[PDB]
Symmetry: D2
Subunit: 318 residues, 4 copies
């Protein structure tokens, strides 16, 4: 029996026996994602080059912003693109808080590298006037999270309490088709991913760990290396093929470079729901209690045995 | 003035003052590429999952094979997908030889990583009955070469004697729009690309070179690292942002890992026509005379200053 | 504030405060319509003609049939394509009955004339085992009805108790965009539509009426004539521009030619919810009590003043 | 062996053994047609309705054709319904062809989603002087190529040349026109007549009698079915595929007809004749009319030969 994102979402919403607000939020998000995908694949670029005789990042943010606001299901919106949290106008306020990166990896979208949209959805816990404080919740409180990868094909990975599900966007009918149910990451992978250009500033634990991947002390086969530079792409590969992804801290970046609210938490949530792990080295990403909507957080995620091994090395240096 | 791949090709062909055969070959290749793109983005996948109640690489190969044969411009076709060179039936024989990889990086297509089509076009040099020997020409004899990158967007890079030109596929009208005329690679980049998981087996010169990128002896800023795993993606990034890409021999693959005819030569041609370099370490990729259609070849390409620097290190270890 | 078919449907469903079944049904139908649209515009026809080396009406029927069944919201399905009503297997039964024409006007599809999908939704009113009898309800009992016109662009007209709304399918993102809220037909039009090739067999009332349109009683300008041959196209034009559409009974077809359950009723419902009228001449189409799922019914619909005028002539001949 | 518009055009151009200019012209036209199709199917309409928080379709269509032809470097004079005057291509972009076209026929009624299309006729500049409106004033008999794009349930491009008529289906998945009907020929006789009967009151006697014969056959044969979409491209295409007759004659009010000779009548007349059909004004073949004004009107009766001949018999009976 064929399944679409819309049908899947409506059914889960029906089961929750609530107001149906989250369903509207997800539907709106889904539509925004297809709009972003269309723009990312350069639909209509011919008109830009004069066939008939301005930024993807900003457009992507506008799409998500507008779709979520008009869903009447949100009250506070945090975007990697805005300095301050956006407070939805009173007449369109819903009970959910959404943190997202409209177009992750857009910094290098010129080489046509894969890009994506990352998002995390929380329920406003407080009754107070909606404010940026409502987005300051530990990833452990997530109701739903996931991402859209605009790669060779467009896929939406959605994670909730019930697990992780992957949907493929069929451009012929603009429909997200369920192609992978209750996804689980491999217990152990054969691929490690991180920018080794930072080697000189690597934390000792990171240096030793990568060294064990290249020169396994047990003379087993070394891990292969992959680093796209776009978190969505690297994390998705990690989920599908298993392995480990790192963007750790160092003397010069005590807290890392990726952002906790809309990059680390959503990915940590997906990973844990898929049987994987996500750590800052000192603790689970999802347990970090944020104080700033844009605060950074180090992150090591992927296959459990691989993350556990990293933590072993980390511990050795603590 | 807007320009399309079709218009551009027809114009160049008109100037060459020939039979117009290459024009038909390129037109057919262009069509095959759009077909591949449509399938790679998963058009119609809903039907595969039962909305109404072959493998991508095989389909891709069929598309190119069929379009080239029916162009009446080719006589010998070598594909990464077929063990033997395909000899075009007599009634459809043209004077060109085409070596191509229908879907480069398809091995890791499950993670939605970028994939592409690489191609190299030669003029049949020998007058003997067409055979696999017609494809055994040094890259230096290429009439045209290039690739299609199916990434965030689909782009076709075409290289000829007159230079390199980039076209963006506008999905709205199925037209390749010229967006970058006479492209030239940066003299020097800030990114190095290669699978460092092979560190253990790297040749000494490669080890030292990478070491210089991470720990500049001149204490300048270290190069950033990126490795997608898909040659088309990695090479395209190198072209756009400059830098260097490597896939040198391993102690486990003494003759390199990438294939000379449909991976190395085409990319080397694009690089040289863009002002860059491509070497096996011992010589220019384009000068290697092939003896086997699927023989491997090491390859170091990218910005001239960067490749020259690698060659300096290489020499120091020779 | 932008609105989509999905968002609109979910909102109306949320207000009805029911099980959410009709929502799932409509969502499923919407997806089927996009699939039909894609096939009607000939997506992938290149493969049919050998680029790489079933009938549209059958496919359309399969799409609707499969999407409805898998919605878990239907129990009885009547299609212009099937002699007998389809009874949904027990494990997929819902409380709705759907009568539809998968691809209206497909008989003359070879000329690329507009085609469409017509549908009428009823709630099973009985407590017995689902059967063909559940589809034999007067149009007056419709819960929702409408159609998809596959013309210059694809539009879905949906009618319910709250009125008529028009959605435009945006091929770029496969989303139905609301472009016309609470639509109302003109009180009086200037166009009449019917196959005048039947003149010889016309009922006297029809002859006189058409005569009044060509040679106006109040020396008013004559009505313009338009007859596409596809009910969906002709009816949609009547809705948008006002006027009147006819397919009356004659000497050989005393019960008309169009089918009551999936052609006449749906259109009559749309018309009345838009402030228009639909009559068989003797009574309102929606009041006819069917005895056979495929029975025919004459039909005169469109602007109220126009239909009333027809009825005046009709009565003069009774 | 699969064939596309591009491959087909390039091959015919290669055969002609010329400069390759017409090939570039056709390529450019093909591209413009796909862009028009995309817009007609409402791609991106969501942005117009605020999904992220605008010119008329006929204007845009005209701009696309205009821009693509000019940049083809193959044209010198362009006539479109949109501009009162013929456009003279700037010297540095001049080619030897003259193109008359209707960017978006039937756009007067595009709100009801009725079929619309693009009609075009290509001539070779036959003068030695400075390009001017006068170069577009050639009888349809001089056409080098003509055809149309129908934006209906699907998008098809009908191309006619000396070698015959060929139909291409636009595959939206790959933006390619696929040849699906080679050397098309219209039925010798059809069973459908098409014209706006709302003008009955002003019909010329010959037209009145002819329509009368289709509804009430003399030999008591089966009457013809009636079809009138209101969009010339749709009505004409139906006529080509199913055979029959299409009419938009002159009457009392409209003495020289309503349709335009250069970009509506001539192109369709050329397609019809190359397909074995006919196109007459009643007094003579549409293609033989020598124009004096780029926007002059001309009556037109076209379709299956036997049907047109029959019309002409009635017409003569009233002359
Ligand atoms: N479409 C989905 N809705 C929900 C999903 S999926 C998971 C759990 C959930 C919990 C509460 C809830 O409350 P509202 O219905 O938003 O009031 C909604 C949902
Ligand atoms: N469309 C293009 N054709 C050519 C290009 S681009 C570059 C150089 C070239 C050289 C010879 C040639 O001879 P044929 O026409 O193949 O006989 C054709 C071409
Ligand atoms: N999506 C829509 N649902 C309804 C609409 S639109 C109009 C009236 C309606 C009435 C009852 C109902 O009950 P279930 O939800 O089917 O149980 C559902 C609906
Ligand atoms: N692609 C096509 N070209 C032609 C076709 S089809 C029909 C006859 C023709 C005649 C002359 C000609 O001269 P240029 O090549 O325009 O100089 C070109 C053509």
């Amino acid at each position: 029996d064929v399944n679409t994102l819309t049908r899947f979402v409506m059914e889960e919403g029906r089961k929750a026996r609530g107001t149906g607000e989250l369903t509207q939020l997800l539907n709106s998000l889904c539509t925004a994602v297809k709009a972003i995908s269309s723009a990312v694949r350069k639909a209509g670029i011919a008109h830009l080059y004069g066939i008939a005789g301005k930024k993807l990042d900003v457009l992507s943010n506008d799409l998500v912003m507008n779709m979520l606001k008009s869903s009447f299901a949100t009250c506070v919106l945090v975007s990697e693109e805005d300095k301050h949290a956006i407070i939805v106008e009173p007449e369109k306020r819903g009970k959910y808080v959404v943190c997202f990166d409209p177009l992750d990896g857009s910094s290098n979208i010129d080489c046509l590298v894969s890009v994506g949209t990352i998002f995390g959805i929380y329920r406003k816990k407080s009754t107070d006037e909606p404010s940026e404080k409502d987005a300051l919740q530990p990833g452990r409180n997530l109701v739903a999270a996931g991402y859209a990868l605009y790669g060779s094909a467009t896929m939406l990975v959605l994670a909730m309490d019930c697990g992780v599900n992957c949907f493929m966007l069929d451009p012929a009918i603009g429909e997200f088709i369920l192609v992978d149910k209750d996804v689980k990451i491999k217990k152990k992978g054969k691929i490690y991913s991180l920018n080794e250009g930072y080697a000189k500033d690597f934390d000792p634990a990171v240096t030793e760990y990568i060294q064990r991947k290249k020169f396994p002390p047990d003379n087993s086969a070394p891990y292969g290396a992959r680093y796209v530079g776009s978190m969505v792409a690297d994390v998705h590969r990690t989920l599908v093929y298993g392995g480990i992804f790192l963007y750790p801290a160092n003397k010069k970046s005590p807290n890392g470079k990726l952002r906790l609210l809309y990059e680390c938490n959503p990915m940590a949530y997906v990973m844990e729901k898929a049987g994987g792990m996500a750590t800052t080295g000192k603790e689970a990403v999802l347990d970090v209690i944020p104080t700033d909507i844009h605060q950074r957080a180090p992150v090591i995620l992927g296959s459990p045995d691989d993350v556990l091994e990293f933590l072993k090395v980390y511990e050795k240096h603590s």
